Design goal:
- Chain J: This is GP2.
- This is part of a larger assembly, with 3 copies of chain A, 2 copies of chain D (113 residues), 1 copy of chain F (103 residues), 2 copies of chain G (116 residues), 1 copy of chain I (115 residues) and 3 copies of chain J.
- With 269 residues, chain A is mainly β.
- Chain A is 8% helix and 35% strand.
- Chain A contains 2 helices and 17 strands.
- Chain F is mainly beta and 103 residues long.
- The chains are: A mainly beta (269), D mainly beta (113), F mainly beta (103), G mainly beta (116), I mainly beta (115), J alpha+beta (107).
- The interface between B and L is medium-sized, with 15 and 11 residues.
- The structure holds a molecule of 6 linked components (NAG-NAG-BMA-MAN-MAN-MAN) and 2-acetamido-2-deoxy-beta-D-glucopyranose (NAG) (8 copies).
- One 2-acetamido-2-deoxy-beta-D-glucopyranose binds next to loops of chain B.
Amino acid sequence: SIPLGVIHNSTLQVSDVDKLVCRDKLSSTNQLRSVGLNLEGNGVATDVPSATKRWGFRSGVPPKVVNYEAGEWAENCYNLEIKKPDGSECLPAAPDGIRGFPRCRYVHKVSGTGPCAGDFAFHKEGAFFLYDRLASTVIYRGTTFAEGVVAFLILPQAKKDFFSSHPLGYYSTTIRYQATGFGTNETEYLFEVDNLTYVQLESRFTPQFLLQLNETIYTSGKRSNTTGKLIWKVNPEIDTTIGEWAFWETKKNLTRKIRSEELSFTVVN
Amino acid sequence: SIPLGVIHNSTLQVSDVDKLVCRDKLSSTNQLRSVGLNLEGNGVATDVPSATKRWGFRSGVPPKVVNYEAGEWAENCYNLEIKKPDGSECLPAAPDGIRGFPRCRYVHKVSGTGPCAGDFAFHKEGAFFLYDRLASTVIYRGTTFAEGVVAFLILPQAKKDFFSSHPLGYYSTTIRYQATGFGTNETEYLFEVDNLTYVQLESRFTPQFLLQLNETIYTSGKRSNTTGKLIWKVNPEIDTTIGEWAFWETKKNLTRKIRSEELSFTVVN
Amino acid sequence: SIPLGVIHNSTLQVSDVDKLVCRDKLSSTNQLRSVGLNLEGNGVATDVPSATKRWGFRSGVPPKVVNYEAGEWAENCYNLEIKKPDGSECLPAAPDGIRGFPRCRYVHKVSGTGPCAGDFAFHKEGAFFLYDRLASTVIYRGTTFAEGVVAFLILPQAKKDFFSSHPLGYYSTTIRYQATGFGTNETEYLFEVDNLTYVQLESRFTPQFLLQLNETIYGKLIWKVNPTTIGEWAFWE
Amino acid sequence: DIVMTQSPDSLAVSLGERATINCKSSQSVLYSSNNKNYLAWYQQKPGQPPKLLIYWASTRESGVPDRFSGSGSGTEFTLTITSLQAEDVAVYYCQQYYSSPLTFGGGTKVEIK
Amino acid sequence: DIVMTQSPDSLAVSLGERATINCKSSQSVLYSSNNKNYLAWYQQKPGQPPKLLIYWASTRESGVPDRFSGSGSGTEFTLTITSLQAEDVAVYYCQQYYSSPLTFGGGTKVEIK
Amino acid sequence: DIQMTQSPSSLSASVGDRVTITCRASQSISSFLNWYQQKPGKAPKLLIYAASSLQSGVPSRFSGSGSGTDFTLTISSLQPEDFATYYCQQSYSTLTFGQGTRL
Amino acid sequence: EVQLVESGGGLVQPGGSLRLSCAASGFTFSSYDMHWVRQATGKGLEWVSAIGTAGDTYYPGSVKGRFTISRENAKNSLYLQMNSLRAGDTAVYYCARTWFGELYFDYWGQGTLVTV
Amino acid sequence: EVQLVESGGGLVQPGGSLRLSCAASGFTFSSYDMHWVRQATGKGLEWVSAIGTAGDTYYPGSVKGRFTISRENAKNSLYLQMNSLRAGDTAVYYCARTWFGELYFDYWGQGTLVTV
Amino acid sequence: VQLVESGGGLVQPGGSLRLSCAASGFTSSSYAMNWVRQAPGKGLEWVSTISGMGGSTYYADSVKGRFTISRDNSKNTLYLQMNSLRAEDTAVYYCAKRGYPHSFDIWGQGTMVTV
Amino acid sequence: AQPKCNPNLHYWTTQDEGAAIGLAWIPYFGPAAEGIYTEGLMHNQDGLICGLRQLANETTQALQLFLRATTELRTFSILNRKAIDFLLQRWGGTCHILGPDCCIEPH
Amino acid sequence: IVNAQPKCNPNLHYWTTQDEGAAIGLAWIPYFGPAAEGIYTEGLMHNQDGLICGLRQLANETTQALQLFLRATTELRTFSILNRKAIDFLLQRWGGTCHILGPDCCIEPH
Amino acid sequence: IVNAQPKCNPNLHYWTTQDEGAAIGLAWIPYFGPAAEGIYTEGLMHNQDGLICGLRQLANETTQALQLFLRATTELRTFSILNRKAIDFLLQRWGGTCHILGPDCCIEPH
Ligand SMILES: *[C@@H]1O[C@H](CO)[C@@H](O[C@@H]2O[C@H](CO)[C@@H](O[C@@H]3O[C@H](CO[C@H]4O[C@H](CO[C@H]5O[C@H](CO)[C@@H](O)[C@H](O)[C@@H]5O)[C@@H](O)[C@H](O)[C@@H]4O)[C@@H](O)[C@H](O[C@H]4O[C@H](CO)[C@@H](O)[C@H](O)[C@@H]4O)[C@@H]3O)[C@H](O)[C@H]2NC(C)=O)[C@H](O)[C@H]1NC(C)=O
Ligand SMILES: *[C@@H]1O[C@H](CO)[C@@H](O)[C@H](O)[C@H]1NC(C)=O
Ligand SMILES: *[C@@H]1O[C@H](CO)[C@@H](O)[C@H](O)[C@H]1NC(C)=O
Ligand SMILES: *[C@@H]1O[C@H](CO)[C@@H](O)[C@H](O)[C@H]1NC(C)=O
Ligand SMILES: *[C@@H]1O[C@H](CO)[C@@H](O)[C@H](O)[C@H]1NC(C)=O
Ligand SMILES: *[C@@H]1O[C@H](CO)[C@@H](O)[C@H](O)[C@H]1NC(C)=O
Ligand SMILES: *[C@@H]1O[C@H](CO)[C@@H](O)[C@H](O)[C@H]1NC(C)=O
Ligand SMILES: *[C@@H]1O[C@H](CO)[C@@H](O)[C@H](O)[C@H]1NC(C)=O
Ligand SMILES: *[C@@H]1O[C@H](CO)[C@@H](O)[C@H](O)[C@H]1NC(C)=O
């Protein structure tokens, strides 16, 4: 008895099982649709430090997957390469059908070592991990996924009104992270600017900030040196908060731009 | 053309599909159910020697699996771990979905070696090996199953009376059998009470008797002897046959309790 | 929106979903049937040199499989055992469910080496490779298949005259080929009459002629063989 | 095809001192279903048929004295003689019955000092 | 488990010309997802702890001079010293970090001629 | 199903005291216990979000303690308004309440 | 008490045929499946054949087509018949009894030396 | 910069126990995953233990139960507790730090030698 | 910020009653509101809950087939249609809003139903 | 025909979706594979149970033949096919009001 | 018509899975039963040239839609197409708000 | 409304598999067709905030039922939920014994 939403006159009335309302008309199975809506649209924190907290590892529960016919572009998607600290596999390899989430503005690729208590990784929020029209309850290794929930819809009159046209470019950038103690409270992440330069990661940092940081490091960060890989603590030294608003929020406009000079860098050690 | 059974007023009449009586009323799929009734209820002997004879090996027939939503508690379930005399695999390894039959009072974990003349093991009587809501026509290694048959039912929708209401934790004991020549008329079984003591098994012996044998052997079994592994032969010296009645009937009947003295043990040298 | 064909009064009229015509009745699910009709029936050349041209290798497209309940006897079926010149597999191993196409009069077992650009082999014409009630878009190593197209039918009113009885003896001959440069225009085939004797292929050759070639002959030997038009008629003719 | 390799080809140790024979298998012989290792240890004294010391990696045969203790999991196993009396000079073999070929490792010869 | 094999046990070569150490893994350590080879090279000078030279099969460590060049893909790998010097004399090791047991290949000793 | 038991059925303490009220679950609930304070004759008020988290606007003196199977609530200073009865709710399955505890 | 007696063995020319007999006493022969294990003079034990209780014959690759193992329960004797013996098959052959239902060889018999 | 120091090596009677301590400086000890690596005199480097950030312990088969590794973050120290040592364990034990989130050992401590 | 309950009264055994819970200061459509029943002197038990949009209706074991609960999101009102009232149902009923562990957070003033 | 019919049926079934209200629906915070099942005993009516057992024994013939025809490794559509067939037979086409072939009750 | 294709086969020799009713033997049991090769049943439809030559066209035309449908779905193996066609047929005849006289729904008045 | 939920995204940018009818070119053929990445299509439903926002709420609400349904089912891969919803809809409206002028049956005279 999953709730089946009925769209009438561009208004969403969830259906009533017992009522068998005469009005609603299901002409064909085309009208039936499953929609996978991302969590990022729900106002949840979407940065990898906070997002990892919602994911969790448990064992003794079999993984399940569902198909969602249509999905929403996700600003942030995550690809995990977690391995156990001895190098053992932590996340199950993707089954043949499973493929990466189709449309992602920012792919957060986390490769690192973490305690891996459970056989599989599950979403503590109850949501599904969306993979290319397949919604799973378990994280699969090395496949881009966007955490989301699946909604089932009865589309209106199949008159091309909904999901057939835009009533009214795909460029995906990979933000590569490295993590230790993945899946525990004591987790630390390093944003990987390049092979030799890493930046300590905090929740405040947004993907736009991280890309700007990458540019700033490249232009004037003296990233290349013989000392070794450099881990930099970074703080935007601007009075306003960094990326409080969500991606949709205020169309991300009139947003203060943190010129390269504002960012402050110190070497952790 | 699978027979479908309609329950009217707590009376079961097979659906008159050709007659198409409208009286039967399938309001929703919740009414439709599949029941995995086990053969143990049917009154067939359930002891490992007789039960194994029903099981047979064939090649060239592909395994098929069915889904039964609900099922019956089974007094006796089996967990074959058969290997060929070389050590080569005999029973196909369990697929990912398949899991052990739930709610088994006694799990007969037969182990040992036998000639396997076929790719897969099939039920001669035509029944379905039942695994965790997935009835199968073949035996999978290492997974508890109860041989059974699947019935499709149109449940009454009056008040979710069946399978959702009682008309009005379980402890599963593993009885370990060691066997040679599994799947042939020459099969020989040893019940493994302990790691140094085994009792030669006969069909008449029932699981309750076997557990009682376990206790009696604990007292006088002379298990802790350096001589070697002991294959005891046991006879219950009583006028009536042990386990004459079925498990449902025998509890209704006055139970016969066999004293330790009555059991007779002869070493086999 | 797969076209569905309604068979009424032994005449096939594709169902018009829009018109909601009431002549057709779907008394039971049995009336619905998916039939896999072989591509050879349409008239295309069925010999290995011509048939190989249709098959092509592509990567980045996932293989898909659809079942067809009923099928047609295939005069020519192909079994492929193509390895890259290293020996690396070129065709994916057959999945558990997939099995060889049944009811093949001639099984053209092609074994050899060829460049394999794609992960999977696909049919350029858009047809399906048929495997024992499973139609797949890709070729599976070692499994006999027949090129075909699946059609979906509403059988007539449970009369069961169609596909449950014949309104109005299976012997399979395994023709064997060795190939190099399989999957490209520069492909050479020499038919394996015997272990030590081979005859080079030409497009004109038919299974019957190849079968007689064994009789005709009587350090592996490759024979160039010359016998107007041969087999201009289709197999049924 | 699991191939057993015993790490010390010879093991000279003085009387009464612990001896350890290492046994590496190409593949893990631990069975997931029962979580018990499918390995056995055989002792072949010179001039006699081999004798079954330890089975199930750790379980000790009834006749075998308590001195012989088997331990290990997964790919590699070890047999430890807590006190090596002179009468235990022999060649010690592994066996894996996890898989089809039932291979045995090359023998390890223990010699008293 | 991947077992790492370094083909030249000892590689005596004169100073100033290329020296190549070959490393073979039982099964390939090239991960499909990132197409990065999970192999590292360690240099152990006599009486010092091993120091990382080349990681990700080809990527070089910050301190390491450009003389140490590493290459290879899939199952087999190699380390090439473009010009050997007296200071380079050491035992060079392999590591595969692609699997559950971290394994180091047997060392290869280079010696000046 | 799981059965919720508050160990102290009733207890009396003076103002300014340390008191612990314990609610026990027959089977472990993963920190899904929330505490309710019901003033006598008035609708219950939520206290602890889930085992430890303290509801916004509820006095900080109330402290939520949580564990796998046994949960406790401690009142720091026993002000007179906090002398009212308390309840424990599980959220693992069926949302049962423990029998109320009387101060 | 399980006691295994082995017979046969000797010098056989390469490619010749030999029959090895393992008489068994002290246990029920039919119940227990039996194996042949050969120890090369300079090498460790190698499993060379196995017979099930039902008479099915199982061989490793080395002797896959050249060795025939047979048990006749009636007279309680087990035979390994060796054909096309090569110089490699010059080991000491031990008939072994696997434990009931298990694949470890609990009881062995004194070996018989075959020289090719 | 990064300095790893080994301590506690010595002579241990076979079957006895030894505790090895690795002090660390110049980096944040808590974040990085620390490993112990064993190098026998003639057998090359061998990985013997791993400790994660959260205290999770991983061992190879050889020391699966014999060895317990522990890290105490506050004092920047790594502890390897060796029990039931056998003759094979004699070697030079290194405490190594893998790079953040990867399994290659960037920094190795000055080795300590334990003899059984 | 306020939840108001109404409809309580005297009903003979059997029969039906409708309890109306109305939301003030909250858009009830968004939040999943719940009904909790406190028997006099016998503690609190949860009787039913609804999803925010009304798609999911959830009931306790005791009233699984007896109570029908529905939400009119337009009016920010919740209706609990008690039917076939039994003797034990003579208790005060509270309507509350879901929380982090399905926790009733804002409690409207209880209404009394007597059989 | 059956030799002995067990009069009482003890059934294990998957939990009702409506029944679960706790945050145990969450997979991570939830019952393991063993816990999902819900218990029942249909001991009240012996005749129904014996009919059910006979029905299952009779149906196994068709179920096995249907499995043979299908190429499904795992067949989960039998119930859906029964529902579709039931609807298709009741309302396949051109229901006659008065006629009992399609039973639509005029007032 | 089948004019487009160069040659249409007049005889259609079809192989189908066995009729359920056809097998009355104890061969229903999988163990005592025909192997995978033998399950198939045989038929010939040579009499009707028009029907088969139409079917071959229908297949040729429908592969266009079928391949797109397979591309859309993530089914490794797709077995629900016939069920979906049945569901569409029912939903088309009885979508809702049926009119007795109106052509939208179809039930002849008398 | 969706203020129960912390933030609602006003814009819905949806990616979906292409419609069967639109594609006419010889790109349906798998060999000549677009790769897996390219099959998708785009849309924006920004104009109507109310429907899409309600939709996010509906998805948050339905996830509980979806998870419980997955727990009960043994499906490794579940693709039948939509079909089961369809058959539920038909079984519910037209299960049987439907009065010509009744609440149970949708049928209406004239
Ligand atoms: C569908 O939508 C709902 C509604 O938005 C989502 O509900 C969210 O659930 C997540 C987790 O399931 C919650 O995050 C938690 O935050 C906690 C911190 O306190 C938060 O509580 C507030 C919620 O307010 C509502 O509930 C309270 C409690 O009754 C009422 O008082 C209040 O009036 C509201 O009714 C927020 O307002 C506040 O800002 C905080 O965010 C954490 O404690 C919690 O658990 C953490 O700690 C646990 C113990 O260590 C640990 O187990 C966890 O893993 C985690 O570390 C968790 O982080 C959201 O707060 C909650 N939102 C709302 C509005 O309730 C639901 O998740 C979503 N589901 C899907 C599938 O999409
Ligand atoms: C992280 O969780 C563990 C689990 O008990 C705890 O011991 C540790 O103190 C926690 N860390 C912090 C910083 O709270
Ligand atoms: C940002 O990082 C990318 C790779 O992620 C790199 O190619 C680019 O050079 C960086 N930016 C600048 C301004 O260099
Ligand atoms: C067992 O059956 C076989 C037939 O396969 C027969 O030859 C043999 O004699 C039978 N043995 C017994 C003890 O019945
Ligand atoms: C039966 O034997 C087992 C060990 O084989 C022992 O643990 C148990 O106590 C014995 N008795 C019963 C009643 O299980
Ligand atoms: C007996 O066998 C069991 C496993 O069945 C094992 O756990 C136990 O330790 C063994 N005990 C002895 C004394 O062999
Ligand atoms: C084969 O095709 C390739 C690629 O188009 C072309 O370069 C070559 O000339 C062709 N050769 C023949 C013989 O057709
Ligand atoms: C000829 O080849 C076949 C296989 O194609 C093989 O079975 C047969 O033994 C061979 N015969 C000779 C004489 O080479
Ligand atoms: C990082 O390493 C990779 C692999 O060697 C190389 O392709 C890339 O150019 C490197 N980038 C930098 C900035 O060093």
